[PDB]
Amino acid sequence: ISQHATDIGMGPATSCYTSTIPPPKQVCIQQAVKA
Amino acid sequence: RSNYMGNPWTEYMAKYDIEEVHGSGIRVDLGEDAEVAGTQYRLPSGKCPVFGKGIIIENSKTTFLKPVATGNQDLKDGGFAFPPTNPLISPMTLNGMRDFYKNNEYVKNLDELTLCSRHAGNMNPDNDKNSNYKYPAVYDYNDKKCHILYIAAQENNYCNKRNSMFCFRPAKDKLFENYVYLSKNVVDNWEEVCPRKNLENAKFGLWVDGNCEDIPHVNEFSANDLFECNKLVFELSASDQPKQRYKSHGKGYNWGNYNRETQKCEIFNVKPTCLINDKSYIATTALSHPIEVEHNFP
């Protein structure tokens, strides 16, 4: 079930992100994604 | 022996060698793995854009591009797309992306599909130390919008109750005709090396002893028109969906010869190596647009 979610392509529970294309900028999801 | 030599079709037919040019699943693309904070994840990796592909969520064909449910929302209230951020990253118009990347000469002039793919591959989770994870995306030709997909899953039908996991499946549909499903690996020269147009007055064949021969074995599915034939080829194409090792690497029923007069979709899983000029036929692929044709032979 946890394995099944991974096997079908469900991604990481993530809140904050940083660009890989310059300039470095933090972006966060204000409210948590429903899991 | 040299039974396959002197093929004048080699360069022209390169884009139809789907294991080579795309190299992953089409219906379901999960051709790569990415490690994020100790856990291994699956992600789309096909090198070609998939024209007309969308995700149907429990009969609804108008929900998958809606942002994923956040905060107090129940899971079934949202779709698959990236939720709103400050500043907004998704969705973003083509003009918005060209303006956003105006100082980056390696990004700002990319074609719309490659630009959407590179924009979706930009924001990396802070948990992902090695920057492995790159989100897939959907480009919508109707309003020129790039939609980053927070959910990389394409099929689930483990599914059901507003907070339980929704059931979903990939498909070509009239409502998805202007969409393009894009993995993180979409090549910048897809226009040159990937399929797009259906080939009018042409049928795929195999080059043998200086002649283009018919595909010896085909699977015949009745189809009212080219669109229905393209939908059937897509439904049977390369899939990385777990069957219970789960990687197709592009192998599958990816091609179809559509006879418009007999209304037969002649589906096959071996790469074609030439074209036969036949006015009764239209040559389609699972990657191809379900409508657009190229009137001229080759």
Residue numbers in the entry:
A (entry chain B): 2036 to 2070
B (entry chain A): 102 to 258, 262 to 264, 269 to 352, 389 to 442
Verbatim from the authors:
The heterocomplex PfAMA1-PvRON2sp1 was crystallized using recombinant PfAMA1, comprising domains D1 and D2 only, from strain FVO. The PfAMA1(FVO) polypeptide chain was traced from Arg102 to Pro442 with gaps Gly259-Arg261, Lys265-Ser268, Tyr353-Asp388 (the D2 loop); 33 of the 39 residues of the PvRON2sp1 peptide were traced from Ser2037 to Lys2069. As with the homocomplex, the bound peptide in the PfAMA1(FVO)-PvRON2sp1 heterocomplex adopts a boomerang shape. The buried surface at the PfAMA1(FVO)-PvRON2sp1 interface of the heterocomplex is 3115 Å2, larger than that of the P. vivax homocomplex. The structural differences between PfAMA1(FVO) of the heterocomplex and apo PfAMA1(3D7) are, as with the PvAMA1-PvRON2sp1 complex, largely confined to some of the loop segments that contact the ligand. The loop 172–176, which is disordered in the apo PfAMA1(3D7), could be completely traced in the heterocomplex, revealing a conformation closely matching that found in the PfAMA1 homocomplex. The loop 226–233 is displaced by more than 5 Å upon forming the complex and is essentially identical in conformation to this segment in the PfAMA1-PfRON2sp1 homocomplex.
In this invasion model, AMA1 and the RON complex then bind together linking the merozoite and erythrocyte membranes to form an essential structural component that maintains the MJ ring. The receptor-binding site on P. falciparum and T. gondii AMA1 (PfAMA1 and TgAMA1, respectively) comprises a region on Domain 1 of the ectoplasmic domain termed the hydrophobic groove and a region immediately adjacent that becomes exposed when the mobile Domain 2 (D2) loop (residues Ser347-His393) is displaced by the incoming ligand.
